[PDB]
Design an enzyme around this catalytic site. Structure first.
Site, PDB file in Angstrom:
ATOM      1  N   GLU A  79       0.787  -1.213   0.000  1.00  0.00           N
ATOM      2  CA  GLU A  79       0.000   0.000   0.000  1.00  0.00           C
ATOM      3  C   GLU A  79       0.831   1.281   0.000  1.00  0.00           C
ATOM      4  O   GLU A  79       0.451   2.298   0.595  1.00  0.00           O
ATOM      5  CB  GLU A  79      -1.065   0.009   1.100  1.00  0.00           C
ATOM      6  CG  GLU A  79      -1.998  -1.192   1.001  1.00  0.00           C
ATOM      7  CD  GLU A  79      -3.390  -0.933   1.545  1.00  0.00           C
ATOM      8  OE1 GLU A  79      -3.675  -1.417   2.658  1.00  0.00           O
ATOM      9  OE2 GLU A  79      -4.220  -0.317   0.838  1.00  0.00           O
ATOM     10  N   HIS A 336      -1.367  -1.623  10.523  1.00  0.00           N
ATOM     11  CA  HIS A 336      -0.859  -2.987  10.572  1.00  0.00           C
ATOM     12  C   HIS A 336       0.393  -2.979  11.380  1.00  0.00           C
ATOM     13  O   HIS A 336       1.192  -2.033  11.290  1.00  0.00           O
ATOM     14  CB  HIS A 336      -0.480  -3.511   9.167  1.00  0.00           C
ATOM     15  CG  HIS A 336      -1.658  -3.886   8.325  1.00  0.00           C
ATOM     16  ND1 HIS A 336      -1.882  -5.184   7.972  1.00  0.00           N
ATOM     17  CD2 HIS A 336      -2.621  -3.121   7.780  1.00  0.00           C
ATOM     18  CE1 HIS A 336      -2.972  -5.180   7.223  1.00  0.00           C
ATOM     19  NE2 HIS A 336      -3.461  -3.965   7.103  1.00  0.00           N
TER      20      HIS A 336
HETATM   21 CA   LIG Z   1      -5.456  -0.990   4.338  1.00  0.00          CA
END
Ligand SMILES: [Ca+2]
Length: 348
Positions: A79, A336
């Site tokens: 990402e 995350h």
């Molecule tokens: Ca995400």
């Protein structure tokens, strides 16, 4: 022997048009900070005192760490979408990593979000996009990046090499069959890449797979992906079996529902209560919400994976896990937890 250190992290660097509104800091500011923290963690060892009886419940050291590991060799990010933020990130990571690849779609829109950083030369690279016929409405592409790296030479002038793959899989929680199709393709592509770049003599030191797989190892909803054959060939150090976590494994998706430094998050995630409040857990189907704290089981949804093959390596070398860590150094900067693994490659 020789130790090699890998890390995976989903850093959520979206274009500002698509990212959370009402922010005093933009994606470029976070990207610069993420890059600086990674560099500073990788460049500076933390104090390591002598341990007389190390890791008695496991074959290797495991922890929740406030830092990226010192002497990190390979970094796989997901990402990384915003191009200006990716530039800031590369400028910061360049202070530590000599070989950085981004815009990897060229080796297959440049919307994979994948970035790879390495201390070792990159010999070959391939990118493959997972099929997604969607009437041209995808904003990003999910796919897999395959790397072959040169990691040394033997006294007999044989080249020492390693294989790395990183991926970001299909995200919708109900789409179990689509992720199994993607894992089938990842398995096929790993073998194709190995074959295409196998053709001085070469000795393979490691074969690692990592990324944001978007399926956990604790819920019944993800049961088919948990049983996938990839886990037979690429070992998951956190797993006892399909849907069965080791007791020390923790979730890697933070519950996004306030200054929380890396040290604070580390302390929080070392407690069962802190994990129940900070990490994502399987949603209760009758309420559509995270279950009440007292009813939650396990240590959270672990959806970021760091795997290593035992087969296919130089027969004369034992490549084994030396350390496994869940990282809190990006607390507040992404949703995350980065995951890292050290492999010790030894002979005799
Ligand atoms: Ca995400």
């Amino acid at each position: 022997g020789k130790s090699f250190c890998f890390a995976t992290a989903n850093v959520c660097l979206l274009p500002d048009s698509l990212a959370r509104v009402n922010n005093l800091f933009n994606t470029q500011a976070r990207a610069k900070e993420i890059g600086q923290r990674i560099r500073n963690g990788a460049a500076r060892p933390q104090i390591k005192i002598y341990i007389d009886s190390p890791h008695p419940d496991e074959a290797f050291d495991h922890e929740v760490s406030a830092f990226f590991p010192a002497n990190l060799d390979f970094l796989c990010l997901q990402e990384v979408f915003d191009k200006r933020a990716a530039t800031k990130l590369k400028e910061q990571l360049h202070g530590y990593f000599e070989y950085i690849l981004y815009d990897v779609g060229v080796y297959g829109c440049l919307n994979s979000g994948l970035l790879f950083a390495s201390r070792y030369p990159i010999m070959d690279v391939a990118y493959h996009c997972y099929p997604n016929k969607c009437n041209d409405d995808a904003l990003a592409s999910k796919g897999a990046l395959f790397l072959k790296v040169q990691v040394g030479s033997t006294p007999q002038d044989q080249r020492i090499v390693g294989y790395i793959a990183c991926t970001h899989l299909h995200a919708p929680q109900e789409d179990s069959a689509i992720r199994c199709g993607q894992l089938d393709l990842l398995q096929d592509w790993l073998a194709d890449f190995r074959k295409s770049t196998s053709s001085p003599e070469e000795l393979v030191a490691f074969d690692v797979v990592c990324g944001d797989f978007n399926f956990d190892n604790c819920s019944s909803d993800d049961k088919l992906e948990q049983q996938h054959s990839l886990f037979t060939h690429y070992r998951d150090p956190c797993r006892l079996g399909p849907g069965e976590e080791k007791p020390w494994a923790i979730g890697t998706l933070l519950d996004t529902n306030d200054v929380c430094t890396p040290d604070n998050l580390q302390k929080v995630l070392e407690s069962e209560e802190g994990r129940r409040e900070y990490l994502a857990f399987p949603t209760s189907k009758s309420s559509g919400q995270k279950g009440r704290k007292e009813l939650l089981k396990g240590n959270g949804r672990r959806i970021d994976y760091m795997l290593h093959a035992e087969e296919g390596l130089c027969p004369d070398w034992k490549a084994e896990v030396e350390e496994f860590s869940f990282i809190t150094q990006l607390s507040g900067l992404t949703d995350h937890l980065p995951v890292a693994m050290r492999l010790m490659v030894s002979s005799g």
